[PDB]
Design a protein around this ligand. Structure first.
Ligand SMILES: *CC(=O)Nc1ccc(NC(=O)C*)cc1
Lengths: 17, 127
C-alpha cells in the first residue's frame, strides 16, 4: 500500500528526468 | 475497515476550465498530519504526493506543474480534493487517489476533456 505507492512514484520520477 | 469513497466517478469538463475531483475518507474531530499520506495519479504520471503536511513538488510530473494542487483545508473534512486549472486534452483519462490515514484504500475516477460547443460549430460549418 503506501510504501508500494511511494516506490512507484519514486520510480516514475526518476524515469521522467 | 478504512474506506475511501468518491461522490462521483466520472467528470466531464470543458477544455480550458478548472476542475476539482474528490476523494472522501474518514476523519474524526481533528486531523493528524503525522498519519496522513495522499497520492494522486492518472495514467502513468504522478500528480500529488502529500506526505506528512508536505507536498514534494519534485515528484510531480512536469505537465501538472503550477497547474494541479491539493486543497489543504478540505483535508480536515476528510476530502482529498485535487484541483487542476486550465485543463488540457491530455488531462482526460483514469485518475486514481490513494489515501493512508490509519488504514489505506483507493478509488478510480474517469475524467474527459471535450471541446466547447463553438468548436463543434465551426466544424459543422464545413457541413
Ligand atoms: C521502494 C522504492 O523506493 N523503489 C525505488 C526504485 C527506483 C528508484 N529510483 C529510480 O528509478 C531512479 C527509487 C525507488
Amino acid at each position: 500500500d503506501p510504501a508500494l505507492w511511494m516506490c512507484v512514484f519514486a520510480a516514475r520520477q526518476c524515469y521522467e528526468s | 475497515a478504512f474506506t475511501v469513497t468518491v461522490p462521483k466517478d466520472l467528470y466531464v469538463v470543458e477544455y480550458g476550465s478548472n476542475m476539482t475531483i474528490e476523494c472522501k475518507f474518514p476523519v474524526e474531530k481533528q486531523l493528524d498530519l503525522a498519519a496522513l499520506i495522499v497520492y494522486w495519479e492518472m495514467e502513468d504520471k504522478n500528480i500529488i504526493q502529500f506526505v506528512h503536511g508536505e507536498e514534494d513538488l519534485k515528484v510531480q510530473h512536469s505537465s501538472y506543474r503550477q497547474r494541479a494542487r491539493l486543497l489543504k483545508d478540505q483535508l480536515s473534512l476528510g476530502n482529498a480534493a485535487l484541483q487542476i486549472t486550465d485543463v488540457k486534452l491530455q488531462d482526460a483519462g483514469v485518475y486514481r487517489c490513494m489515501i493512508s490515514y490509519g488504514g489505506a484504500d483507493y478509488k478510480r475516477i474517469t475524467v474527459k476533456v471535450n471541446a466547447p460547443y463553438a468548436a463543434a460549430l465551426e466544424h459543422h460549418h464545413h457541413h
